[PDB]
Design a binder for this molecule. Structure first.
Ligand code: HEC
Ligand code: HEC
Ligand code: HEC
Ligand code: HEC
Ligand code: HEC
Lengths: 156, 445, 207, 149, 43
């Protein structure tokens, strides 16, 4: 338990700022999606399919303050920062991942192809004798956008 | 007056000494044979068990438990009787318990021994039960304190202790008396050296006052524990979602069951501890008379709950809890509940006739029958609503195996085996307070 | 009775106090009954294949980057080089015969945590954990000490306090690795980015 | 378990209560284990018996005797006795022999091979050896409960 | 240090009755769990 809680309090802040910058991006995309696919799809559940995440993402912001303030209030318990940080990044990467799964379907209808830039798209585990996932994570990371997914569809 | 005996302060010591003076009983040699044989049957089937597996008991999965934990509630519900007449009767200070008290925490502590074996053994993995304890173990693991099966452990691992330490402290003047006799008249000169449990006793002012407030303390500090021990062992049932359990009146109820079970055995011991090896002058029959009230209290308090059960089925029950008690009366266990409730209600409401039926031989034939319903009370309440609970798919009768019964029997075996063992060594009667309370110990003479 | 049992509370108290002292300063529960240097069928001597032959670990412990429960090599690996490098020793005639037969090499193992608590190297290695931490510094090890217990209470200290251990994944299999200064803050920036989120639960390995 | 009736480890004969109450057999249980009567059906002098179970679905004068379950098997492995102190018979399902022995009665040889699913002429004889028959469900027919709706 | 296989008291579930890959199999000619595949097979 190296040096207390105050060390981790810098990186937990560095996560919440990524969320705050994504309030802009998600709500910005929520404008753009209404602009891009006005009538090119069902859009009646499928637009709200993107909004339903948004009320959760904003709800976690007020929480991420409450999560964090319960840590910075008393820096004498190491077994809350690793957990609050493990919760944030999961509650963060989830919402990043949930935005994507709803956003890849956008291309799936506008384009007849959900693109080959969709995911790592590696394969099953027995397809490691040919393709270790190491290759794949350097494909996915260096090709796939987290939330530049629909702005990418402004190029289409 | 509450004891009928032409005694003085000395007359008890010569008599209880004669009950612990020399070692040559014959009925002992029969009891230690049949009882230890009962204990042999117990372990003959209890290690036969663990080398093989749980299912030799008659337990299906819906009714996972069967007779073992039923007997745990029995062999602890039977035991609260002994500790509470040590505690309660000092809280109300009825100055009446003295004739029987010291023989009772025995009747509790050995019940707790043959009780605690069941939670250690109706499990399938006995060896991995120390994990249940909150030791900082070989990893970063610890038990789950939302589990009444754990509360049971701390409770019984405290209730074996507090009832003991309150009994051991209860019997200090005995060891003083026996340590005092071992020199001048007794077994050997080397019984004195065995009686160091006196712990430098002299009966002094400086610490006898402390003994009183401690006996007060443990009275007002073991009763709040007794009302939590059996309540824990009821919480394990009623905390559940089962309709026949989730009814909230059960913890007071099972406690009253522990009353109506425990005194229903103490009388079985006192009758047979009154005929051959008896104390006519100290175990006054008027004592058993005023004893069966607090039984007959729970002869009706137990009965009122059956009404509530049988009522709430008609008042605002779930459509399952509606069925849960129709099962109890009408269904497979009609042999149990119709007769059980009637057994536990007829005989108490047939008990008070001739001024509480002071007659001694009726006590034995009744105190059994009052208790047999208790083993049904916990075989009914637990199991009769543990099958036929929220599915028809989980409908299965409970066929008890021939090994279920030899464990029940063996519980009587080890109980009598070890209850008799120390009882022949320690003195039966609480001789310290007997000659100190009702006789002329009062300074008004 | 006896006059000097004033000394008797001492042996009652002290010997009871020593009951605690002898209990807790004696435990060594997963440090005494773990570590051992077993006698193999042939002695591999990781010393030589690593310490003065300069092989990294992915050669013959293949499928540690991609699999779970990475494999001890087959006999075939020795036949890459010990078909025609030595051809002399009275130490591995089991090996040459084994390639010339079908009875595989009778390998004992270590670190055998039970098979009700599964494990995956690739889940760790790809996410930056090294063999120095867990399997010990093997580069000078004629036979395996298993210097770490590989029990839960130690298995879990990393999943609660990971950033004291994890490697940057650049040349992870380097036994002579001193980490840098400002190690920790250089690491947490990866858990913020890489998003590893170690497991604390029952679901991970015990199933 | 068969889907009709959660039956295991025995061939059976399923039929109506109206034939059962007109034949004289039952699926009585006083222990939640379904003790069962028998039939001793007899075709052309090739009779065998089997447990009768009852179902409220089947029609008059008809029984669906399932096949298999009467297939004698000859074991190479030992019966694997252990001391009476140890349980093996209840656990060692592969012990007393291989599996297919005595699990039920063989029924295929009885029929007539003309339209060789059906058959007539079973001079039923309600006889003894009324032994167990086991299920998982053990019951049925929820009392108007919210479980399928 | 403790050169023998160390004391593990509860051996109930260490060495499961089933056997994973690369584990002893006391049945076959070649004591081995893999039982390699016949030629011609295809994933
Ligand atoms: C590089 C960093 C690593 C190498 C090279 C190896 N390990 Fe691991 N390892 C660990 C355990 C608990 C086991 C036992 C597996 C089981 O019992 O199921 C293993 C296994 C191996 C083996 C083979 C031995 C076997 O078959 O059991 C090899 C060759 C091996 N490991 C090499 C534990 C850990 C661990 C801590 C988390 C780490 C980081 C690694 N192992 C990583 C490496
Ligand atoms: C082949 C040329 C090897 C090289 C290079 C390395 N290892 Fe090794 N390893 C090898 C074998 C055949 C064995 C079996 C052990 C025996 O009884 O001889 C091992 C053993 C290990 C182990 C212990 C596994 C076990 O037996 O339970 C570990 C953790 C291990 N090897 C790791 C390891 C690392 C990290 C290496 C490079 C740094 C390495 N090995 C080299 C084969 C070969
Ligand atoms: C080529 C890359 C090698 C592979 C693959 C393996 N080994 Fe090796 N081994 C190699 C050399 C060049 C040497 C000799 C170095 C020296 O110090 O003399 C060795 C040595 C051994 C020995 C020692 C032989 C003895 O002293 O009697 C053993 C037991 C040995 N090697 C075993 C071994 C095994 C079992 C291997 C596969 C699992 C293996 N080696 C791989 C070179 C190479
Ligand atoms: C560092 C010192 C570690 C030790 C020791 C152990 N683990 Fe680990 N583990 C570690 C990290 C950094 C991670 C997360 C990587 C990520 O990107 O998520 C993990 C993860 C696991 C998992 C993940 C779940 C899965 O994929 O199935 C498992 C099952 C796991 N670790 C198991 C495990 C066991 C059984 C260990 C000791 C016996 C163990 N880990 C030690 C880092 C470290
Ligand atoms: C790895 C990812 C684990 C996690 C998370 C947890 N456990 Fe653990 N446990 C693990 C191992 C590898 C071992 C073996 C230690 C040994 O004694 O050799 C254990 C041990 C246990 C045990 C003891 C088993 C024994 O044989 O003594 C228990 C009861 C246990 N673990 C429980 C447990 C629980 C309840 C956890 C979370 C809910 C848990 N473990 C986390 C691996 C891992």
């Amino acid at each position: 338990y190296p040096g207390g809680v105050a060390l981790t309090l810098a990186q937990i802040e560095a996560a919440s700022e990524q969320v705050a910058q994504d309030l802009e991006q998600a709500l910005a995309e929520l404008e753009a999606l209404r602009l891009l696919a006005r009538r090119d799809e069902t859009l009646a559940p499928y637009v709200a399919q993107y909004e339903a995440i948004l009320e959760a993402h904003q709800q976690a912001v007020l929480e991420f303050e409450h999560w964090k303030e319960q840590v910075a209030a008393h820096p004498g318990d190491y077994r809350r920062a690793n957990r609050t940080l493990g919760a944030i990044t999961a509650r963060h990467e989830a919402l990043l991942q949930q935005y994507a799964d709803v956003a890849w379907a956008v291309a799936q209808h506008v384009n007849p192809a959900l693109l080959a830039r969709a995911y790592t798209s590696s394969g099953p585990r027995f397809f490691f004798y040919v393709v270790p996932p190491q290759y794949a994570r350097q494909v996915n990371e260096q090709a796939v956008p987290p939330l530049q997914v629909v702005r990418y569809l402004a190029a289409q | 007056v509450l004891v009928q005996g032409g005694l003085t302060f000395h007359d008890i010591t010569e008599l209880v000494a004669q009950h612990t003076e020399k070692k040559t009983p014959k009925a002992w040699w029969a009891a230690f044979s049949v009882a230890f044989l009962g204990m042999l049957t117990l372990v003959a089937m209890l290690a036969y068990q663990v080398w093989n597996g749980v299912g030799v008991w008659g337990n299906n999965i819906p009714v996972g438990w069967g007779w073992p934990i039923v007997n745990f509630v029995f062999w602890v519900g039977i035991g609260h009787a002994g500790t509470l007449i040590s505690a309660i009767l000092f809280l109300f200070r009825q100055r009446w318990r003295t004739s029987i008290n010291r023989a009772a925490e025995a009747m509790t502590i050995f019940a707790v021994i043959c009780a605690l074996i069941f939670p250690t053994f109706h499990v399938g993995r006995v060896w991995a039960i120390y994990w249940t304890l909150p030791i900082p173990n070989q990893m970063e693991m610890w038990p789950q304190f939302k589990s009444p099966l754990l509360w049971d452990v701390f409770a019984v691992s405290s209730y074996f202790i507090v009832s003991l330490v309150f009994w051991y402290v209860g019997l200090i003047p005995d060891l003083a008396t026996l340590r005092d006799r071992a020199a001048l008249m007794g077994r050997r000169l080397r019984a004195k050296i065995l009686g160091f449990f006196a712990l430098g006793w002299c009966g002094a002012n400086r610490h006898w006052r402390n003994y009183e407030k401690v006996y007060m303390l443990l009275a007002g500090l073991a009763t709040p524990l007794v009302l939590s021990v059996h309540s824990v062992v009821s919480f394990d049932f009623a905390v559940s979602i089962i309709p026949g359990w989730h009814t909230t009146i059960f913890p007071p109820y099972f406690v009253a069951g522990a009353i109506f079970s425990g005194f229903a055995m103490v009388v079985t011991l006192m009758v047979i501890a009154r005929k051959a090896y008896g104390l006519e002058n100290v175990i006054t029959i008027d004592h058993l008379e005023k004893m069966n009230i607090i039984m007959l209290v729970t002869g009706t308090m137990v009965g009122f709950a059956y009404i509530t059960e049988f009522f709430i089925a008609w008042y605002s029950g779930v459509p399952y809890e509606q069925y849960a008690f129709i099962n109890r009366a009408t269904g497979p266990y009609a042999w149990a509940y119709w007769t059980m409730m009637s057994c536990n209600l007829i005989f108490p409401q047939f008990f008070w006739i001739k001024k509480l039926r002071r007659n001694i031989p009726f006590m034995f034939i009744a105190s059994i029958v009052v208790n047999i319903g208790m083993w049904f009370e916990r075989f009914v309440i637990t199991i009769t609503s543990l099958h036929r609970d929220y599915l028809p798919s989980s409908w299965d009768y409970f066929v008890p195996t021939w090994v279920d019964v030899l464990t029940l029997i063996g519980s009587f075996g080890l109980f009598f085996t070890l209850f008799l063992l120390f009882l022949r060594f320690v003195p039966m009667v609480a001789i310290a307070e007997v000659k100190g309370v009702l006789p002329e110990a009062d300074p008004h003479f | 009775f006896s006059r000097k049992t004033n000394r008797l509370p001492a042996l009652s108290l002290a010997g009871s106090v020593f009951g605690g002292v002898l209990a807790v300063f004696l435990v060594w529960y997963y440090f005494s009954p773990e570590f051992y240097e077993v006698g193999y069928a042939p002695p591999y001597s990781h010393r030589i294949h690593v310490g003065k032959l300069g092989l990294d670990c992915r050669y013959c412990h293949n499928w540690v980057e991609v699999s779970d429960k990475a494999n001890i090599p087959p006999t075939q690996t020795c036949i890459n080089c010990h078909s025609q490098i030595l051809t002399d020793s009275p130490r591995l005639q089991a090996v040459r015969d084994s390639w010339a037969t079908d009875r595989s090499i009778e390998w004992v193992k270590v670190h055998h945590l039970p098979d009700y608590a599964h494990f995956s190297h690739a889940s760790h290695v790809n996410n930056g954990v090294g063999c120095e931490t867990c399997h010990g510094r093997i580069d000078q090890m004629d036979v395996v000490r298993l210097v770490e217990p590989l029990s839960m209470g130690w298995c879990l200290e990393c999943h609660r306090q990971p950033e004291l251990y994890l490697r940057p994944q650049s040349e992870i299999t380097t036994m002579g690795y001193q980490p840098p200064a400002d190690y920790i803050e250089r690491n947490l920036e990866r858990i913020r980015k890489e998003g590893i989120r170690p497991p604390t639960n029952c679901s991970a390995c015990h199933y | 378990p068969d889907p009709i009736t959660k039956i295991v480890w025995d061939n059976v004969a399923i039929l109506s209560p109206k034939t059962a109450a007109a034949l004289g057999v039952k699926a009585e249980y006083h222990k939640g284990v379904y003790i069962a009567d028998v039939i001793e059906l007899s075709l052309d002098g090739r009779a065998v018996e089997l447990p009768v179970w009852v179902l409220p679905g089947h029609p008059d004068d008809s029984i669906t005797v399932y096949l298999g379950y009467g297939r004698e098997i000859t074991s190479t492995r030992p019966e694997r006795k252990t001391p009476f102190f140890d349980l093996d018979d209840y656990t060692d399902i592969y012990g007393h022999g291989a599996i297919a022995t005595g699990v039920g009665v063989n029924v295929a040889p009885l029929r007539r091979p003309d339209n060789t699913w059906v058959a007539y002429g079973a001079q039923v004889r309600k006889t003894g050896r009324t032994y167990k028959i086991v299920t998982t469900q053990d019951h049925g027919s929820m009392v108007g409960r919210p479980l399928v709706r | 240090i403790s050169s023998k296989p160390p004391v593990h008291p509860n051996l109930n579930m260490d060495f499961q009755e089933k056997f994973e890959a690369q584990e002893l199999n006391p049945f076959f000619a070649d004591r081995r769990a893999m039982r390699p595949p016949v030629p011609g097979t295809v994933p």
